[PDB]
Design an enzyme around this catalytic site. Structure first.
Site, PDB file in Angstrom:
ATOM      1  N   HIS A 113       0.835  -1.384  -0.008  1.00  0.00           N
ATOM      2  CA  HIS A 113      -0.123  -0.133   0.166  1.00  0.00           C
ATOM      3  C   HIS A 113       0.866   1.226  -0.138  1.00  0.00           C
ATOM      4  CE1 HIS A 113      -3.422   2.803   0.942  1.00  0.00           C
ATOM      5  NE2 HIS A 113      -2.338   3.562   1.708  1.00  0.00           N
ATOM      6  N   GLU A 114       1.867   1.173   0.991  1.00  0.00           N
ATOM      7  CA  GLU A 114       2.860   2.435   0.885  1.00  0.00           C
ATOM      8  C   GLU A 114       3.426   2.503  -0.398  1.00  0.00           C
ATOM      9  OE1 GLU A 114       2.143   4.638   3.192  1.00  0.00           O
ATOM     10  OE2 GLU A 114       0.827   3.143   3.679  1.00  0.00           O
ATOM     11  N   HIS A 117       1.976   4.626  -3.106  1.00  0.00           N
ATOM     12  CA  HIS A 117       2.091   6.049  -2.698  1.00  0.00           C
ATOM     13  C   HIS A 117       3.353   6.619  -3.145  1.00  0.00           C
ATOM     14  CE1 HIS A 117      -1.582   6.881  -0.622  1.00  0.00           C
ATOM     15  NE2 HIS A 117      -1.498   5.990   0.297  1.00  0.00           N
ATOM     16  N   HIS A 123      -5.124   7.432  -3.212  1.00  0.00           N
ATOM     17  CA  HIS A 123      -6.304   6.648  -2.451  1.00  0.00           C
ATOM     18  C   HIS A 123      -7.337   6.424  -3.478  1.00  0.00           C
ATOM     19  CE1 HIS A 123      -4.493   7.081   1.828  1.00  0.00           C
ATOM     20  NE2 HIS A 123      -4.533   5.671   1.555  1.00  0.00           N
TER      21      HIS A 123
END
Ligand SMILES: CC(C)C[C@H](C(=O)NO)C(=O)N[C@@H](C)C(=O)NCC(N)=O
Ligand SMILES: [Ca+2]
Ligand SMILES: [Ca+2]
Ligand SMILES: [Zn+2]
Ligand SMILES: [Zn+2]
Length: 158
Positions: A113-114, A117, A123
């Site tokens: 998830h990180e 980014h 998101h």
């Protein structure tokens, strides 16, 4: 749209969590980067020391960046968008229980998830997407990028 104008990116794991072994920590991190790699032109290379594009550290509360962490649960981690310096970097709350299992929290899924980014993804509103704002455990064995996330990095790069 911040994006890396280079395709092979290096990353450095500055420290570790005592929750997992270093080998398990390194495997969680490696597999997370592989997900984005198999769907984009980015190639990721680990370095033991030295400047790396993406630094990865397990920090606590105040850790020098104006984005203090918050103790167990709550925010699990944060990463910065493509750029120099802190750009691309990823911090994990050292106060969480990091796991390898279905127990909260699975470092591999939070890492994956990180990194979205760090590559410039925000998101998504799609609850099934990895870039969804809140964590949810999904089987990690032979885990693959949801189509929503695939659409997202592919729209940034190729
Ligand atoms: C403090 C802000 C940046 C929220 C933070 C986050 O989304 N970082 O990318 C976070 O810890 N979100 C929680 C809700 C979380 O579980 N994120 C990781 C996940 N989606 O796997
Ligand atoms: Ca950086
Ligand atoms: Ca926390
Ligand atoms: Zn931070
Ligand atoms: Zn996030």
């Amino acid at each position: 749209n911040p994006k890396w104008e280079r395709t092979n990116l290096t990353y450095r794991i500055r420290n570790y969590t005592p929750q997992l072994s270093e080998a398990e920590v390194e495997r969680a991190i490696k597999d997370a980067f592989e997900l984005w790699s198999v769907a984009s032109p980015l190639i990721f290379t680990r370095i033991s020391q030295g400047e790396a594009d993406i630094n990865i550290a397990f920090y606590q509360r105040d850790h020098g960046d104006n984005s203090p962490f918050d103790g167990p649960n709550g925010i699990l981690a944060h990463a910065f968008q493509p750029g120099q310096g802190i750009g691309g970097d990823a911090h994990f709350d050292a106060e969480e229980t990091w796991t390898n299992t279905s127990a909260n929290y699975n470092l591999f899924l939070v890492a994956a998830h990180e990194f979205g980014h760090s590559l410039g993804l925000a998101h998504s509103s799609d609850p099934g997407a990895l870039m969804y704002p809140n964590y949810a455990f999904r089987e990690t064995s032979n885990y693959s990028l949801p189509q929503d996330d695939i659409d997202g990095i592919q729209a940034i790069y190729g």
